[PDB]
Amino acid sequence: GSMKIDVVTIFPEYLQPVRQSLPGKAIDAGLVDVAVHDLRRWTHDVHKSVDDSPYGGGPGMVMKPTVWGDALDEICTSETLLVVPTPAGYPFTQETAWQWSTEDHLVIACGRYEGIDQRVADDAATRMRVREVSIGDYVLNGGEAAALVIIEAVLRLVPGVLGNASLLEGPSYTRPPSWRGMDVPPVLLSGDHAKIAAWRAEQSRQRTIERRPDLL
Amino acid sequence: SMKIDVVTIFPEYLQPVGLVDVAVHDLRRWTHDVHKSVDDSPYGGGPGMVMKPTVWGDALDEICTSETLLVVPTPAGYPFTQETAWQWSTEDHLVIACGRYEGIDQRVADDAATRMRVREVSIGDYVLNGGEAAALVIIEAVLRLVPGVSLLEGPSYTRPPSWRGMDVPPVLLSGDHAKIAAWRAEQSRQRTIERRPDLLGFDSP
Ligand SMILES: N#Cc1c(-c2ccc3ccn(Cc4ccccn4)c3c2)n[nH]c1N
Ligand SMILES: N#Cc1c(-c2ccc3ccn(Cc4ccccn4)c3c2)n[nH]c1N
């Protein structure tokens, strides 16, 4: 019913859409609080360094464990579920979203560059629950867009937070009944509601075969 | 060179975005009525609402050409994958139609498909409240591939070599390129079996 989400990122402005997506009613009811933190608050040096070269060589850079360690020490508690987006993560699915929707405290650690030194998650996992997850089979530049997806998918399952109320869903239609030469399937206007449900089931079967045969 | 037009009833949500131009359009600009209505109840019943085809048709008429790739996020879409991102990275013009409510009248995509290429896609197996976050994901994955810009990655490390009593794997400090390459390959394949066995052709957990 109530959840705190802390997001840590070197691009705090990226997370502005979700703070805007929150209805005042939910905030006022104390049902939800989303806070965004600039990782550079926890840097050690005048240059506010968050990255360094990879051990073993290779392209790109790795985010520093000492900076992240300090950030997570301050923000996390023993009750925290630490969420770490990564293209190498376990798949984030609707099952995940449902599970996380009843958590009291999510912390989302958004990486950039080539990711975060693995000891950050490994150390954190010795005192809290840690979940390395991926939102899909494509590569992003960092975790912020993944955080937006995760926050939306989770919070829409928490009663009253975002203001909203297997096989693939089939097509939907509304007025007008005819538009640019295309008519709404007459069965939908038939008043035969058992037949409509059967029609929708077959549309779902066809669409699932065409687009996601793996689900069958 | 690529142009991306995004159409949405929440242009503010697209704020997180010279070889590429991204323009964001408020769908309600193409309404005529005072209440600027973009949604109506579904034919055949069901919870929620459906976006009207009329408003969308007018918006897309103005923004699209026959050369346009029309992208429509939907939980019922074909999977958007890295292959898709590579394919779209060489397009001149993407238009991303972001829905809300329970989605968009199917005739919008069907009508558009008579004039241009249309792709209904899903970014993953979870449900969002609308297409805007999916648009941000798609734009990021595509733009990083535009000219002039398998297996799971194993763990990465940087300085210091010992932290909180946790050591960087000694092989990575050894300077032995062959041993490091081998270790990284093993770590990758080990992570893949554990987290995404489907990528190697095994059953999902
Ligand atoms: N979830 C998720 C993700 C991400 C993601 C998440 C976090 C980071 C932090 C840095 N990068 C860039 C990067 C590029 C190459 C290799 C490693 N890392 C991220 C990418 N990409 N695709 C997903 N489904
Ligand atoms: N890509 C992608 C998506 C979406 C997505 C995309 C566009 C819309 C427009 C409205 N909704 C809400 C909604 C809820 C229930 C049934 C239908 N529609 C969207 C959801 N959800 N999950 C994905 N991987």
Cα maximum dimension of chain A: 72
Please report residues of B whose CB lies closer than 8 A to that of A170: 76
Show the tokens assigned to B35: 């209440």
Please return the burial class of A203, using the count of CB atoms within 10 Å of its CB with bins 0-12, 13-18 and 19+: middle
Quick check: A56 and B133 CB within 8 A? no
Total residues found in chain B within this entry: 205
Atom of ligand 2 nearest to the CA of B129: 12
Rounded CA gap, B46 and B102, in Å? 10
Q: Does B179 touch chain A (CB under 8 A)?
A: no
- Here the tokens at position A11 are 């691009």
Distance CA A88, CA B132 (A): 24
Mutation test of the interface with chain B: which of A119, A122, A138, A202, choosing the one with the most B Cβ atoms within 10 A?
Answer: A138
Closest alpha carbon to A41 in A17, A3, A75, A18: A75
Domain boundaries, chain A: 3-156
Q: Chain A closest CA to B111's CA: distance in Å? A: 7
Residue whose CA lies nearest to ligand 2 atom number 23: B75
- Reported resolution in A? 1.5
Round to whole Å and give the CA distance between B186 and B194: 12
CB B136 within 8 A of CB B17: yes
Residue of A nearest to B184 (CA): A56
Q: What are phi and psi of A8, to 5 degrees?
A: -115, 130
Among residues B97, B87, B88, B94, the alpha carbon closest in space to that of B68 is found at B94
Q: Which residues does A185 contact at the CB level (< 8 Å), separation at least 6? A: A173, A199
Which residues are registered as beta bridge partners of A77? none
B58 touches chain A (CB under 8 A): no
First-to-last alpha carbon distance for chain A, in angstroms, is 34
Chain B contacts of A51, Cβ < 8 Å?
158
Give the residue from B198, B46, B153 showing the smallest Cα distance to A58. B153
DSSP code at position B39: E
Closest chain B residue by Cα to residue A171: B106
Q: Around Cβ A178, how many Cβ atoms within 10 Å?
A: 10
Please, which contacts does B32-37 make with residues 24 or more away whose CB atoms are closer than 8 Å? none
**Residue A130 pairs with which residues in a beta bridge?**
A82
Using alpha carbons, select from B193, B32, B136, B66 the residue that is nearest to residue A142: B136
Q: Which residue has the tokens 């912390």?
A: A107
Pick the residue whose CA is nearest to atom 18 on ligand 1.
Answer: A114
B153 CB under 6 A from ligand 1? Answer: yes
Helix (H, G, I), strand (E, B) or coil at B6: strand
The DSSP element (H or E) to which A97 belongs, if any, is helix A94-100
Residues with Cβ within 8 Å of residue A73, at least 6 apart in sequence: none
Does the B2-144 domain belong in CATH 3.40.1280.10? yes
Query: Quick one: which H or E segment has residue A35?
Result: strand A32-38
Instruction: List all residues 6 or more positions away from A84 whose beta carbon is below 8 Å from its beta carbon.
Output: A108, A109, A111, A116, A121, A130, A131, A132, A133, A143
Reference A203, options B48, B114, B50, B44; nearest CA is B44
Burial A47-73 (b: 16+ CB within 10 A, else e): eeebbbebbbeeeebbbbbbbbbbbbe
CA distance B13 to B10: 6
Rounded to whole angstroms, the Cα distance separating A94 from B121 reads 17
Instruction: Return the CATH fold of A3-156.
Output: Alpha/beta knot (3.40.1280)
Residue B20 three-state SS? strand
Q: Strand runs (DSSP E) across chain B, as ranges?
A: 2-8, 20-26, 39-40, 50-51, 69-79, 93-97, 117-122, 162-163, 166-167
**C-alpha distances in angstroms, B19 versus A80, A180, B3, B147?**
42, 36, 9, 9
Does the beta carbon of A195 lie under 8 angstroms from any beta carbon of chain B? no
Answer for the pair A162, A21: CB distance below 8 angstroms, yes or no.
yes
Of residues A42, A26, A46, the one with CA closest to residue A162: A26
Alpha carbons within 13 A on the beta-carbon side of B118: 19
Residues in chain A: 216
Q: How many CA atoms lie within 13 A of B110 on its CB side?
A: 14
